[PDB]
Structure formats: C-alpha cells, structure tokens
Amino acid sequence: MAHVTLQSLSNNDLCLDVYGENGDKTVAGGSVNGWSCHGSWNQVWGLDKEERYRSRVASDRCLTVNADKTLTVEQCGANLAQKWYWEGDKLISRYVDGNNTRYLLNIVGGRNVQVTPENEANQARWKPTLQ
Amino acid sequence: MAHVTLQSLSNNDLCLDVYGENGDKTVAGGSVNGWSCHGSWNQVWGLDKEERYRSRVASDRCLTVNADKTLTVEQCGANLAQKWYWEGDKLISRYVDGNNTRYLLNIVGGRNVQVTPENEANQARWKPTLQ
Amino acid sequence: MAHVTLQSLSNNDLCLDVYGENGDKTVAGGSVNGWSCHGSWNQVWGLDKEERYRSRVASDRCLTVNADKTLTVEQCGANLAQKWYWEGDKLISRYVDGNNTRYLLNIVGGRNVQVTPENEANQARWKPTLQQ
Amino acid sequence: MAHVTLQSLSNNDLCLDVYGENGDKTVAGGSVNGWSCHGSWNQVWGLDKEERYRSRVASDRCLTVNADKTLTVEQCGANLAQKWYWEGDKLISRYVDGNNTRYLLNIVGGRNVQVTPENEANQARWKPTLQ
Amino acid sequence: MAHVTLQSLSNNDLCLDVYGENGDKTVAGGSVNGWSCHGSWNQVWGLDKEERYRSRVASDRCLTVNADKTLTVEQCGANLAQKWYWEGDKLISRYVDGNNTRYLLNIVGGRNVQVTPENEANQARWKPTLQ
Amino acid sequence: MAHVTLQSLSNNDLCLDVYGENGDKTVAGGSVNGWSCHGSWNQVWGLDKEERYRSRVASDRCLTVNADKTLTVEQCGANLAQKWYWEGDKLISRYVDGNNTRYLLNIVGGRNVQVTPENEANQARWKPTLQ
Amino acid sequence: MAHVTLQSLSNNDLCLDVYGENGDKTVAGGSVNGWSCHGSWNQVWGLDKEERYRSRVASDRCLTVNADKTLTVEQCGANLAQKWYWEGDKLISRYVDGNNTRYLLNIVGGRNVQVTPENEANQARWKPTLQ
Numbered sequence A, B, D, E, F, G: 001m002a003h004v005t006l007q008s009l010s011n012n013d014l015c016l017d018v019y020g021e022n023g024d025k026t027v028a029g030g031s032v033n034g035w036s037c038h039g040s041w042n043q044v045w046g047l048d049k050e051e052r053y054r055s056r057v058a059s060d061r062c063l064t065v066n067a068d069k070t071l072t073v074e075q076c077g078a079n080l081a082q083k084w085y086w087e088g089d090k091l092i093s094r095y096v097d098g099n100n101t102r103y104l105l106n107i108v109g110g111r112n113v114q115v116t117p118e119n120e121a122n123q124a125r126w127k128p129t130l131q
Numbered sequence C: 001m002a003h004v005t006l007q008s009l010s011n012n013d014l015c016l017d018v019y020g021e022n023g024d025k026t027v028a029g030g031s032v033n034g035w036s037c038h039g040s041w042n043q044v045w046g047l048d049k050e051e052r053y054r055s056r057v058a059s060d061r062c063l064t065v066n067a068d069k070t071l072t073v074e075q076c077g078a079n080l081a082q083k084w085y086w087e088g089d090k091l092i093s094r095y096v097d098g099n100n101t102r103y104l105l106n107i108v109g110g111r112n113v114q115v116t117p118e119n120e121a122n123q124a125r126w127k128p129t130l131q132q
Helices: none
Strands: A003-008 A016-020 A033-034 A044-047 A054-055 A063-065 A071-074 A084-087 A090-093 A101-110 A112-118 A126-130 B003-008 B015-021 B031-035 B044-047 B054-055 B062-065 B071-074 B083-087 B090-093 B105-109 B113-116 B126-130 C002-007 C015-020 C031-035 C043-047 C052-053 C062-065 C072-076 C084-087 C090-091 C104-110 C112-117 C128-131 D003-008 D015-020 D032-034 D045-047 D053-055 D062-065 D069-074 D084-086 D090-093 D103-109 D112-117 D126-130 E003-008 E015-020 E031-035 E043-048 E053-055 E062-063 E071-074 E084-087 E090-092 E105-111 E112-117 E126-129 F001-009 F015-020 F030-037 F043-049 F053-057 F061-066 F070-075 F084-087 F090-093 F102-109 F113-117 F126-130 G003-008 G015-019 G033-034 G046-047 G051-054 G062-065 G071-074 G086-089 G088-095 G103-107 G112-117 G125-131
Touching: A033 A112, A063 F090, B071 B113, B071 D112, C031 C112, C072 C112, D032 D112, D069 D112, E031 E112, E071 E112, F030 F113, F070 F113, G033 G112, G071 G112
Parallel strands: none
Antiparallel strands: A003 A016, A003 A044, A003 A126, A016 A033, A033 A071, A044 A054, A054 A063, A063 A071, A084 A090, A090 A101, A101 A112, B003 B015, B003 B044, B003 B126, B015 B031, B031 B071, B044 B054, B054 B062, B062 B071, B083 B090, B090 B105, B105 B113, C002 C015, C002 C043, C002 C128, C015 C031, C031 C072, C043 C052, C052 C062, C062 C072, C084 C090, C090 C104, C104 C112, D003 D015, D003 D045, D003 D126, D015 D032, D032 D069, D045 D053, D053 D062, D062 D069, D084 D090, D090 D103, D103 D112, E003 E015, E003 E043, E003 E126, E015 E031, E031 E071, E043 E053, E053 E062, E062 E071, E084 E090, E090 E105, E105 E112, F001 F015, F001 F043, F001 F126, F015 F030, F030 F070, F043 F053, F053 F061, F061 F070, F084 F090, F090 F102, F102 F113, G003 G015, G003 G046, G003 G125, G015 G033, G033 G071, G046 G051, G051 G062, G062 G071, G086 G088, G088 G103, G103 G112
C-alpha cells in the first residue's frame, strides 16, 4: 500500500492532519483537520483495498465522515462514511444521506477542513503525494 | 469464480444477506434481505457461469426472484429468475413478465431488499466487493 | 464444436427442444419447439463449420427452417434454410425468400418456436449455453 | 491455395458451377453458371496469387468475364477479365469497359449466374466456403 | 527491392513497358509506354531508396518524366522527375510544373502512357504486381 | 534528477537565470530573471520529486513565486509557490491566489521573467534542455 | 546523427547548399542558398541534439537565420535562429520576432533560399535525404 500526504491544491500550504484529542494523536475519535504540511506520521495516509484512508498514527485508524460532516479517525469498518474515491483532484466520500448529494473533501472557513456538498465546495482540490 | 460481498452504495451500511429460515441460514428457500456488513458466509456470494449468484452458506443455494419480487436462496436451476447481470453499479435480474420492465436489486425500506422496476428503483446501487 | 443448449432470454424457462414425431426424437422431419430446460440430448446442439445447428438426438439431424417457417430436424445439406448466425442475442437464419427480410428464431406463443420476420420478432432473445 | 466452393447467400441453394460444353467439363471456353451445391470438382475453386479463380476441373481453367457479362473458364493469363476480389460478401471483377461500372458476380434471374453492374446487382452475396 | 510489373487497372491488359529504340530495350533515353503484360525484363521494375523506379532491362535505367510529360528510362540521378510514390492505386510523380499540379501515371490513348494532371487523369489506376 | 537549462522559445536567446545579489548567486532571496544562455550553475535547474525546481547555485535553493508574482530562489519547503508542472512547452505554477487563475512562467519585458495569468501570458514557451 | 542532404520537393533539382564566400565553403558567415543536388560536403547536413543543422563543410558551422531572413552558416550557439524542426515536409525555424508567425525554409526565386512567413511560403517542401 502506497503512503501519501494529502495536500490541498486550493491553499498554498495545507495538508490533511490528525489533530487527535488533547495532545494524543493516536486516539480513536481523534479530530482531523488542516495544518501546514510537514509530513510527520499524523499527515501520512494510505488508501486500502476497501477504499479507506488509513492514518499512519497508529493501527486501525480510518478517515471518517461524521454526521455533522467533520472528520475524525476511527476503527476501520464497512461504513460508506469511511470510503473515499478520486475524480481528478477531487476526493469524494461515498457517504449518503437524505440530501441527494456527493460530499467532497473541502476547506470551508479559513483553514477548516470537512466534507461539503459538491455544489457548495469552493476549495476542494487535493493532491496525493507519495511519501 | 470470485467471492464477493454485495454492499449497497445507496445505504451507509447494508450488505445482501441470507437471513435463512428458523435460525438456519443454509436452508433451501431461506429469505434474503439486507444487514450490516460483516462478511461472514451468509453475506458472501459468487457469480457462476450461468449468471447465478451462489451463496457461500451452503451448496446449491442461488439468489432467486420470487413471484412477489422478494428474494430467497433456492436450489440452482435454469430459470431466468436466478440470472443476474451488472450494468455499472446496477444489478439486474433477467426475470421477464408482462410489465415491460427490467427488475433491479433494490432496498425497499428498512433492511428489506427486493427487486423493483427499473424506473422506480431509487436505492439500487451496489458494489461487488472482493473478499 | 461446443455443445450448447439454446435457452430463451425472452421466456423465464424455455430451451429449443426436439419433440420428434410420435415419441421418437431421432427421426428426420421431427418437430422442433420449446420446453423447460433440462439439458438432455434432445436439447443439446452444436454449431458446425457450415453454420448448421446439429442436434445431439442422432447423426445427421440439423435444425431446419421449413417453408411454413416451422422448425424441424432434417438430414444436413447445403441449403441456407439450415444455416444460422448470431448477432448479439439474436439467432438469425440465412433463409431467403421474396419478402425482403431476415428471419429470426422467435417464440410465437406458449412453447411454439418458429422463425419470424426480424421487424416482428419480439420474443427472439437466446443464449447459447455451454453444456454443464 | 484455400480450396473453396462459391455458394450464394442470395439463393437458398446455388453454387458457382462449371457446366462446360459438349458434356466435357474440362474444355476451355466451357460455360460457368449456377447449380445446386454438391462440392464435386466442377464446383471447387482456388484464388491464386494473381487474383484468378482457378477451377479444379482441369489445369489452366480460370473464371473469366466475357464482354456480354457471361462467364466461362479459359486458359489463365494476365487479363483483368480473370481477376477477382472480395468486399464483404460481394465478389467483384476487375474487368473494365465503357459503362463506367464495377461488375459483381450476380444471379441475374432464376438460376442464371453472370456479372452485373454494381447498382443493379441485387442477388450478389457469396460465401467462399472451405472444402 | 521488390521486383514488380506495373499493370493497369484501367485497361484490361496493359503493363508499363520499356519500348527502347530500334529493338534495343537497354538504351539510355529509350521510350516507355504500354504493352500487353508478359513480365519479361522490360516490364519489371523496382522502387529504390530514392523513390526511383529502376527497370530490370539494364543497370542504371530509371523511369523518367520528360518536360513534355512523356516517359523514358535514363541514368539515375536526384531529379524529382525520377521520383515516384503511391496513393492507393495511383502512381504519382514528384515532378514539379510550377502549377502545383500533381502528375499521375496515366494511359492517354491506345498503348500510350504518360503522366497527366491529376484533375484529368482518367485512366490512371495501377497495381504493382510481385514477380 | 536530470539537470536542465530553461530556455525560452518566445525569445531568441533567454534562459532562466539566478541573478543573485551583489554577484553572489548563492544567496537565499536572490532574484530570478532572464539572461543570454550560457549554462553556468546559475542557469541549471533540476525538478525534484516534490515538483520544485532546484537551482545549481547552492544547496536548498528552490524557484519561488512571490506574492507580487516575481521570482526568487528560497529555502525549499512544501508551499505551492515552489511547485511547478509542465503542459507542453508551458511551465505552470501551483501557486494559488483567489481567482482560480493558473500562473505561467512568462517573459514580461526585456529580461524580466515572472509568472503571469494563463490568459495573458504571451511569452511563456520554454524548453527544458538537458545539460 | 544522420547525415542528410536537404532536397526541395518544390523544385525538380534543388538542394540546400553552402555557397561560402569566394570559393571557400568553410568560412563563418558563409552564404547558404540553393544548388543542383550533388551531395558534396557543402550539401550535407546533420541535425544535432540542440536542433541545429550542422554543415559538413567544417566543424562548428550551423544553419543560421539572419535578421534579414537570409541564411548563413555560423559558429554554433544557443540562439533560436539556429534551431530547426520538421512538420511533415516543412522545415521550420524557431526564430521569433515582432510578427506572430513561424518562418519556413523556402525558395524565394531562382536558387535563392531564405525563411518566409508561413502564410506566404509557397516553395517550402523539403525532404531530408539520407546520404
């Protein structure tokens, strides 16, 4: 499995980053957001066979769309909220809800990263860069 | 023959699942519906040379369209009600009748999966996922 | 030569079947029509190098378009009435007449199978199915 | 050579046949026309490297266009009247004359085989059939 | 170098032929025209690396367009009047008239062969035929 | 990493050149512009795996887009202002402003080289030329 | 590097030729124009890795577009006036000026060869001919 950083092409310096909770980057449920690119383990990801982006912070930590559209790392499972696919420079969630929309990895406000409905996603360009 | 789970792309966690009958998942005539994905034997399927989806629950259990459009596993024979083919993420039965329509594998409410006329099949996206 | 059943995709369970004459499935001139699929010898066919569909019921029994468009098995010869080719799931006869049309293998009601002018052949999907 | 019968696809049973003349089928200048297919040597042909159809009745007997569109077998030479090429199921002569047309092997009426101007050749389908 | 005859497809029996001068086919400046095909050396040609058609009559005898558009065999040189190329069954000279006219090998009457402006080359089909 | 000069195809003799500061071509912050091509160290560049153009003048000197679109060499980092990619003879910056504008390496008068919005870039052809 | 003559396809016998100055074909600044083709060293050329056409008359002599659009041989350098590329039978200079046009190697009357704006280049067909 190929390990990558996920760098925004919509901001001159922002990578997808596991913040964690209270200093601990390895915890299940740890927050994921944007940070300046440095390429440490908490900015490294790998796309597995089940379309999940696994973080290098620890075993069994997958990138997860939450109900309020924020991102965390969680135990890896079958839910579409953990499945991701690329179309060009767009990184798209398989998450479904009642809105009839695809949700895209997106910077919404300043440097805050979440998923955003396709028709609203103004800063949604990304590049997977081999580590 | 590749063994797959049949996971919905229209529901965040539903796989095609042999419920069985009377607690026994191996029984001829057992019911098929949807369930949280766990990838056990009663959620593993293989498409054979005759376009039948064989369940891994036991020998000679093929996914079958019933007269009322519910699904079961039955002994494998020649009927078109046991034949399936893919078009993109749609899984289509070869079953024919007088209603000028193709029937698609479709979630019809809750954890219930049946086949539904094409023009009405709104929860009908699937991904055959190798195991 | 691949041995196949010829199964309908226009009927939930129908295979091209040599009925024969008076119980004998092997006779020249025997009727061919539809039946539930079972894969026994009178439902097995082979497409030969002359584009004929040879039946397994006996030597020298080829699927034949008759003048009235019904199907029988007959001694194998050169006639276009015995020549068949595929386009997708359509099985087409090389038979010619004065009506400017191709004739397709077609279910014409119940278990009756005949050939039908292309533009009117509405139950005419088939799958040559490798014998199991 | 690939030895073939030349069977019509415009008639339920007609092959290109050396009739001959005097009952002798080997004679130069012998007539060629249509007959029910039987694959004896007077219906077997081989296309040589100079695009001539050589009959198996005897040595040096090529299929030849005459100016009145009738067909014979004649000694083999360089004339375009003896050169043939395929376009799909059409068998076309290289013969030229003042009528600015390509001539196609064709059943003119009944069982009468000649060559015919392309725009008039309505029974001109053939299958070169391996012996 | 493939030795060929150059047979017309516009005439039922005509090959490009070195007439010579007074019975001698090998003479420099010898006339070139058409004849019935027999494939002797004065009808055999080979296309060389400089796009010249060399006659098999004798060494250093190239098919040459003259200013008056007649054909001869001459010593081999660099002039475009000795260069030839095929487009389909057309055999085209690289000769420049200053007109932007392409001159095609063409039968101009009886057994006379010359090159002719493309727009009016009415008998200019050829087949290079392996010997 | 292949080492190249970046020679303009929009000016008869201009190469991308580190001017440096006070004759010192090695300084961080040194200006980059155009000069006649000579291929000394301050005209040699290498594209690295992070898509940065590293100058040969000294270690850790990457070609950098500034906020006013002028070019310098700076310490190498992760910022898009230092990332470049080719499309034919165009060398495109990943630098982001608000406008969705792509900025191209472009001559903007005399020997002045900067990045210019794609629609305006009239002298933006370049050839990466092996040393 | 393949040694070629550059022969016109727009004139029946013209090759690109180093005239030199005063009988010396070797001198820097020597004139280049058209001549009957003979393939001596002053008509032999080689396209190098920098897209320069080097002449065989002497070392370090490249075909050079001058400001007045005449051609000479000069010491080999980086200028686009010495760079050449092929598009079909067109030999195109990389020379740029005020006019937004490509300049093509072109016969401009008699044996005068120059570069001409593409739109007006009507004797500009060439064949690089292996020696």
